[PDB]
Design a protein around this ligand. Sequence first.
Ligand SMILES: [Mn+2]
Ligand SMILES: [Mn+2]
Ligand SMILES: [Mn+2]
Ligand SMILES: [Mn+2]
Ligand SMILES: [Mn+2]
Ligand SMILES: [Mn+2]
Ligand SMILES: [Mn+2]
Ligand SMILES: [Mn+2]
Lengths: 136, 135, 135, 136
Amino acid sequence: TPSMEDYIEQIYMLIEEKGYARVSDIAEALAVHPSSVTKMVQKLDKDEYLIYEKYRGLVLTSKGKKIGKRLVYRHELLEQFLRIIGVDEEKIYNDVEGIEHHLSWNSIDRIGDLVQYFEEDDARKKDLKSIQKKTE
Amino acid sequence: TPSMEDYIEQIYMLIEEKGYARVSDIAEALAVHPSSVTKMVQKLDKDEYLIYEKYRGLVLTSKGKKIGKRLVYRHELLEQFLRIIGVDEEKIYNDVEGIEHHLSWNSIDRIGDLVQYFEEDDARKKDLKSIQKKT
Amino acid sequence: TPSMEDYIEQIYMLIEEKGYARVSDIAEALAVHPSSVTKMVQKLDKDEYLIYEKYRGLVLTSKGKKIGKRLVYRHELLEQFLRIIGVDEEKIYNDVEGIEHHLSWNSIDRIGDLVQYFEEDDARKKDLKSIQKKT
Amino acid sequence: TPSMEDYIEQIYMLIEEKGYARVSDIAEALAVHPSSVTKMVQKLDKDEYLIYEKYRGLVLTSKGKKIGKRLVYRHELLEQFLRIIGVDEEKIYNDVEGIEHHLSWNSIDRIGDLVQYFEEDDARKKDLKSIQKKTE
DNA sequence: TTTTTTTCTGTCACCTTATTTATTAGTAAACAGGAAACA
DNA sequence: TGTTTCCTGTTTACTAATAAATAAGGTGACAGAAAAAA
Ligand SMILES: [Mn+2]
Ligand SMILES: [Mn+2]
Ligand SMILES: [Mn+2]
Ligand SMILES: [Mn+2]
Ligand SMILES: [Mn+2]
Ligand SMILES: [Mn+2]
Ligand SMILES: [Mn+2]
Ligand SMILES: [Mn+2]
């Protein structure tokens, strides 16, 4: 099930952004009651993804850092992919969070071929925009 | 919603392919126990997607067909997109059935424009492979 | 082929009505034991009138559709004939299912002209009723 | 049922045509092997319709001759009906023998009314004959 | 010489009984929370 | 803000029961021969 990965994603993003992994701010961001977060963090601490103390914040382990880096790579790739294709901003975030878990790594690899195709050249992007507008 | 769209999609595909949809066919197509299929047909009948006759069969109403056609169109379009981009053959069917239900129809339409950008010209499909090969 | 034409006739009607033909519904329609329905379905499958799938169902082929479409027209025409002529509605169905399989198509074609002769005017049917009401 | 009525019908027709009915005449009339005729004469002896002798012949009783004339009436009426509406002369007989056994007597009476309707006025036949060719 | 009955014996028509599969109806129980509590 | 303790539906199998579809056997009228009676 998909709900297992986003906690690692969020913990990584949070310790890079503000160095403060905590039970509070990862709850409202997911729009869930903090008791579910309390249960999940304690479930996955037992799988070596975390470092924890009864009155201290969380820290990532050696494997958690690189797993989270891959997750952030995937999320950041897909956001700019969808912007290149041209879906309006209001849609992008939840579209990415919807698909990011079900794509296999072969598809994430081959999407890298596609995103570079429209970024290392100026013209192909404008051809794609011309087609996009020709039947809007 | 996703979990009902899967059943509408599969029922439509079976009707289209062979003219009748059976509980024992939907169960394999979805890889579920048939009790779930019957308990879900008796749930789609009250939303008027289906006409359900107990121990006899089921049929799509005019509401159901209009949805099923769009669902199958989305399925084929996403498969063709992944095939144009070059995903491994065995993985395409696993990825498409995963992502398809979370995608807004807005991005489905924009993918429908992306697919024809490359379908328009034989040159582009290997210009892209010129990006691929230098990895 | 009287005994064989009835199955195709009823299967066509039942597909147009329900959307699917089931062995038990055919058995009730022809008023026979369902094993006699199975035994005849497996024969129509080898005469190529229909496609049969074991424990799954039936589909009419291009032969069977065009045959049954004509048989149903014959049925409706004979019902309309006996209803024009003044027979009480109890016995019309039994008479039709009795005679329809023994009439040649020349007879059917001329009965169509007779029915049209009576449906193109109103005075003709009342002269016919006026002769019935004294002979 | 067909094979039960047609022996009375054909025996009556032969008795009125020639004054006597042999077993061979019935076998040829129904196109069957004569032993099938004798084993049916056994079934009719049991039912009072006729008088039988082991090697001499058949004679209809007062019961048989009443029914046989009504069956001959049905035959002649249906033949005249099919001949009025324009069926080809060679097609008539085989169509009559097919339906005479399944039409109930109510339909036969109504068919008699229909035959009267055309036989009492010549113009109706001309109207029907015009429409009969209008679209061939 | 030609019918006209008595047996032989074959397909067949259709139903009864049994069997194999498919469909439906509860029971359960592990999940995913989540309303009150704390600190 | 950092968690704990019972509640509270959801989702899916599983196990039973219920019916539907199919196959293996019988009967038994109806032909069609081929001898036999006349
Ligand atoms: Mn996520
Ligand atoms: Mn993400
Ligand atoms: Mn689907
Ligand atoms: Mn799909
Ligand atoms: Mn019929
Ligand atoms: Mn009919
Ligand atoms: Mn007859
Ligand atoms: Mn006759």
